Ligand binder design. Structure first.
Ligand SMILES: Nc1ncnc2c1ncn2[C@H]1C[C@H](O)[C@@H](COP(=O)(O)OP(=O)(O)C(Cl)(Cl)P(=O)(O)O)O1
Ligand SMILES: [Mg+2]
Ligand code: NA
Ligand code: NA
Ligand code: NA
Length: 327
DNA sequence: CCGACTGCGCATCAGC
DNA sequence: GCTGATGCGC
DNA sequence: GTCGG
């Protein structure tokens, strides 16, 4: 695991993953490419043959021969064809706009709309999310210094307590994994009257306060238990203005905080691997519970697990501190 | 051969 | 008006 | 695409 050790191969595989997910709409081939890329990135030798990478789990016949052509030529003809393709590469660029998924991108590129500027000229064709994602295209691709994360944590934690002092609020994602910067802010919220009982306005009246102090600036999706939006650091003096940042708030049964904070921590590829091999041991994890798989695919009742892990040694795994879960 | 593949809330689409 | 499906991004 | 029934 030393980045440049096989970065060429994993670059190519990540670039293929993206083409599959954005252009072919083959979310399974995408996941397969992402899994081959990940395992190879952890592998502690430099691959010199597709047959050597083939021994790894998740590398198969087709990827092995893509490794050989890459090794032998420096290039992948499929990739270089794909990158040169004005329709494929437009669709790929469009999906970088929050809210423009792969189906939207195709529909836009089909009707001639290929650039951000094409998009601005056609805002009637855009739902609410897409205009916001287009409004803030550059900002949403910037990183958030951990120091700005902490200032965002102050505002969130301050304004949350102002509403109701038995709210707990927990900033998860890469932040809680110690990351020196983050892509967005992930806030986990629990309140004692949300368990198996309930009154469901707990999220709304927290969003509203954060809007009232002008921290939250836009709304991408808002529900009973999940808010997705935009939020900005207040600025001072004649300062440059901070960028607009993506924030999600997720409100979990307090009874199920542990599964919630594990999922939201996560990382995302780490969750995919932990759940996948929770399956191998006949358990299923989600943000809520951990359940056994009975004779075949059961659930019925889960245990209200009491510890910050146990989730973790139920699946015969040695505890990975959040620093060690960006994997 | 063939199907499973990590898991899910909200917005919007499809349809009655 | 409703229910149920799909796209989308966690 | 890969893996396993
Ligand atoms: N497909 C998924 N499956 C399971 N869990 C997921 C998935 N996607 C997201 N999560 C969980 C896990 C994920 O950790 C959490 C927050 O999602 P972010 O997209 O913000 O992930 P991140 O780690 O914060 C990041 Cl490295 Cl992208 P940053 O934006 O900080 O740079 O939601
Ligand atoms: Mg994050
Ligand atoms: Na193998
Ligand atoms: Na997008
Ligand atoms: Na997020």
């Amino acid at each position: 695991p030393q980045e440049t050790l096989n970065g060429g191969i994993t670059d190519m595989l990540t670039e293929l993953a993206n083409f599959e997910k954005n252009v072919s709409q083959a979310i399974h081939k995408y996941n397969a490419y992402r899994k081959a890329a990940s395992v190879i990135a952890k592998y502690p030798h430099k691959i010199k043959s597709g047959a050597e990478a083939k021994k790894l789990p998740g590398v198969g016949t087709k990827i092995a021969e893509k490794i050989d052509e890459f090794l032998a030529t420096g290039k992948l003809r499929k990739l270089e064809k794909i990158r040169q393709d004005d329709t494929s590469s437009s669709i790929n660029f469009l999906t970088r706009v929050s809210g423009i998924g792969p189906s939207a991108a195709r529909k836009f590129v089909d009707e001639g709309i290929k650039t951000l500027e094409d998009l601005r000229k056609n805002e009637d064709k855009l739902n609410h999310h897409q205009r916001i994602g287009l409004k803030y295209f550059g900002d949403f691709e910037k990183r958030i210094p951990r120091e700005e994360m902490l200032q965002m944590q102050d505002i969130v934690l301050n304004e949350v307590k102002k509403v109701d002092s038995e709210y707990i609020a927990t900033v998860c994602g890469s932040f809680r994994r110690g990351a020196e910067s983050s892509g967005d802010m992930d806030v986990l919220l629990t309140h004692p009257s949300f368990t198996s009982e309930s009154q469901p306005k707990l999220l709304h009246q927290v969003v509203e306060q954060l809007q009232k102090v002008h921290f939250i600036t836009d709304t991408l999706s808002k529900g009973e238990t999940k808010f997705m939006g935009v939020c900005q650091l207040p600025s001072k003096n004649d300062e440059k203005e901070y960028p607009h940042r993506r924030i999600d708030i997720r409100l979990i049964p307090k009874d199920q905080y542990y599964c919630g904070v594990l999922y939201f921590t996560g990382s995302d590829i780490f969750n995919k691997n932990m759940r996948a091999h929770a399956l191998e041991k006949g358990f299923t994890i989600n943000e809520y519970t951990i359940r056994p798989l009975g004779v075949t695919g059961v659930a019925g009742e889960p245990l209200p697990v009491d510890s910050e892990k146990d989730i973790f040694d139920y699946i015969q795994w040695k505890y990975r501190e959040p620093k060690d879960r960006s994997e």
